[PDB]
Design an enzyme around this catalytic site. Structure first.
Site, PDB file in Angstrom:
ATOM      1  N   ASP A   1     -85.341  33.700  14.719  1.00  0.00           N
ATOM      2  CA  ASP A   1     -84.288  34.208  15.602  1.00  0.00           C
ATOM      3  C   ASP A   1     -82.909  33.985  14.976  1.00  0.00           C
ATOM      4  O   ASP A   1     -82.386  32.878  15.002  1.00  0.00           O
ATOM      5  CB  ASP A   1     -84.403  33.531  16.951  1.00  0.00           C
ATOM      6  CG  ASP A   1     -83.371  34.012  17.932  1.00  0.00           C
ATOM      7  OD1 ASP A   1     -82.673  34.982  17.628  1.00  0.00           O
ATOM      8  OD2 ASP A   1     -83.328  33.414  19.008  1.00  0.00           O
TER       9      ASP A   1
ATOM     10  N   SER B   1     -69.445  47.084  12.795  1.00  0.00           N
ATOM     11  CA  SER B   1     -69.977  48.359  12.328  1.00  0.00           C
ATOM     12  C   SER B   1     -68.851  49.379  12.325  1.00  0.00           C
ATOM     13  O   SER B   1     -67.940  49.336  13.161  1.00  0.00           O
ATOM     14  CB  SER B   1     -71.128  48.833  13.228  1.00  0.00           C
ATOM     15  OG  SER B   1     -71.520  50.147  12.868  1.00  0.00           O
TER      16      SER B   1
HETATM   17  N1  LIG Z   1     -81.643  35.939  20.123  1.00  0.00           N
HETATM   18  C1  LIG Z   1     -80.910  34.796  20.634  1.00  0.00           C
HETATM   19  C2  LIG Z   1     -79.818  35.292  21.590  1.00  0.00           C
HETATM   20  C3  LIG Z   1     -80.105  35.605  22.921  1.00  0.00           C
HETATM   21  C4  LIG Z   1     -79.085  36.071  23.750  1.00  0.00           C
HETATM   22  C5  LIG Z   1     -77.812  36.232  23.226  1.00  0.00           C
HETATM   23  C6  LIG Z   1     -76.655  36.696  24.082  1.00  0.00           C
HETATM   24  F1  LIG Z   1     -77.169  37.377  25.156  1.00  0.00           F
HETATM   25  F2  LIG Z   1     -75.999  35.541  24.432  1.00  0.00           F
HETATM   26  F3  LIG Z   1     -75.790  37.462  23.345  1.00  0.00           F
HETATM   27  C7  LIG Z   1     -77.537  35.929  21.911  1.00  0.00           C
HETATM   28  C8  LIG Z   1     -78.545  35.478  21.084  1.00  0.00           C
HETATM   29  N1  LIG Z   2     -83.655  36.151  21.962  1.00  0.00           N
HETATM   30  C1  LIG Z   2     -84.376  34.871  21.970  1.00  0.00           C
HETATM   31  C2  LIG Z   2     -85.678  35.106  22.739  1.00  0.00           C
HETATM   32  C3  LIG Z   2     -86.802  35.482  22.019  1.00  0.00           C
HETATM   33  C4  LIG Z   2     -88.003  35.733  22.686  1.00  0.00           C
HETATM   34  C5  LIG Z   2     -88.059  35.635  24.065  1.00  0.00           C
HETATM   35  C6  LIG Z   2     -89.391  35.924  24.756  1.00  0.00           C
HETATM   36  F1  LIG Z   2     -89.721  37.248  24.562  1.00  0.00           F
HETATM   37  F2  LIG Z   2     -90.365  35.138  24.175  1.00  0.00           F
HETATM   38  F3  LIG Z   2     -89.234  35.667  26.103  1.00  0.00           F
HETATM   39  C7  LIG Z   2     -86.929  35.267  24.796  1.00  0.00           C
HETATM   40  C8  LIG Z   2     -85.733  35.014  24.131  1.00  0.00           C
END
Ligand SMILES: NCc1ccc(C(F)(F)F)cc1
Ligand SMILES: NCc1ccc(C(F)(F)F)cc1
Length: 330
Positions: free
Chosen positions: A35, A199
């Site tokens: 992630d 972008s």
């Molecule tokens: N994939 C991690 C993540 C999940 C949510 C957000 C948000 F919504 F805060 F922008 C950023 C990063």
């Molecule tokens: N963006 C971070 C994140 C990644 C996966 C999930 C899920 F799908 F496993 F719920 C939630 C939040």
């Protein structure tokens, strides 16, 4: 040193990708979601409430001869989708694709939200944003990437996600056989802790390119593409019968339609997302309404170049002292 690991979609819609990661001695292999939008390495474990575990492989620190409890440290995270988890903290050896870090913080979940419990194929998350977002208290912890940086041949990792197919995360080197043309690099702001970039514009289908700055984050952890309402409206206006549905929570479209491509600008280069990548299939089994892969960021507060966009490119995360993001066609 370098590392290389295959990453595999968890389902037929590419909802997420998992990568095997070896934790502990002897190795316990867990499939983690890499992630770039978060900075915690957390896993389902022998300490997770037993009713919140439904088929996940769990990390058992008591079977690892290199695991050490990090006395008094805790962690608590909430994701942008309302997911959350929390627990305590071990240090242990962690290896990805042949690349080993000793003394990596492994956050052991005592509690996980329901949306992790229902996703039997994901054993945890491996955060690759900047360490300033790590949630360990009182002593903040470094990411796997930050810990590995010293020993990598080059301080980079690359994401090559597949469309309905496996792909590759590489650490420490750039595979020049995995892309075509040149890589275009673009500046990153680390001020909010994300891989944040700007972008240079967009085009819908074979339309004219609209030059306009879109600030957003490169997030392998987010499935869809979330862009400003004006952009998303201009895309779906080209799909006959598409509409925004409040009951579904986004744009849907007749499953029989063919979707235009979507182009986004990286400096002077253009990355084209094929229309097929934007189809996320029926909203429910048997339905003739399909869910769109490009949605509005208005309710989220930040624009997110998630997997829909990133899997159209070869993406370089350059964690040099001045960080940059590189994009190439593939
Ligand atoms: N994939 C991690 C993540 C999940 C949510 C957000 C948000 F919504 F805060 F922008 C950023 C990063
Ligand atoms: N963006 C971070 C994140 C990644 C996966 C999930 C899920 F799908 F496993 F719920 C939630 C939040």
């Amino acid at each position: 040193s370098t590392g290389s690991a295959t990453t595999t979609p968890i389902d037929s819609l590419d909802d997420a990708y998992i990568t095997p990661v070896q934790i502990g001695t002897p190795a316990q292999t867990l499939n983690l979601d890499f992630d770039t939008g978060s900075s915690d390495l957390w896993v389902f474990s022998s300490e997770t409430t037993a009713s919140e575990v439904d088929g996940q492989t769990i990390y058992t620190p008591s079977k690892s001869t290199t695991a050490k409890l990090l006395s008094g440290a805790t962690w608590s995270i909430s994701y942008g989708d309302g997911s959350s988890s929390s627990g305590d903290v071990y240090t242990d050896t962690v290896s990805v694709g042949g690349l080993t870090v000793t003394g990596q913080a492994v956050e052991s979940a005592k509690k996980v939200s329901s949306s992790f419990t229902e996703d039997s194929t994901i054993d945890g998350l491996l955060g690759l944003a900047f360490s300033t977002l790590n949630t360990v208290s009182p002593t903040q912890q470094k990411t796997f990437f930050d810990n590995a940086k010293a020993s990598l041949d080059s301080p980079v990792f690359t994401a090559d996600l597949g469309y309905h197919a496996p792909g590759t995360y590489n650490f420490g080197f750039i595979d020049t056989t995995a892309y075509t043309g040149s890589i275009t690099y673009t500046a990153v702001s680390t001020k909010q802790g994300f891989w944040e970039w700007t972008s240079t514009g967009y085009a819908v289908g074979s339309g004219t390119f609209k030059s306009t700055s879109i600030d957003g984050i490169a997030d392998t952890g987010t499935t869809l593409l979330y862009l400003p309402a004006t952009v998303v409206s201009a895309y779906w206006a080209q799909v006959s019968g598409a509409k925004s549905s409040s009951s579904v929570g986004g744009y849907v479209f007749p499953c029989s339609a063919t979707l235009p491509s979507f182009t986004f600008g990286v400096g002077s280069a253009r990355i084209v997302i094929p229309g097929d990548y934007i189809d996320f299939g029926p909203i429910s089994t048997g339905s003739s309404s399909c869910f769109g892969g490009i949605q509005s960021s208005a309710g989220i507060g930040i624009n997110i170049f998630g997997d829909v966009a990133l899997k159209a490119a070869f993406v370089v995360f350059n964690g040099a002292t001045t960080p940059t993001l590189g994009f190439a066609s593939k």
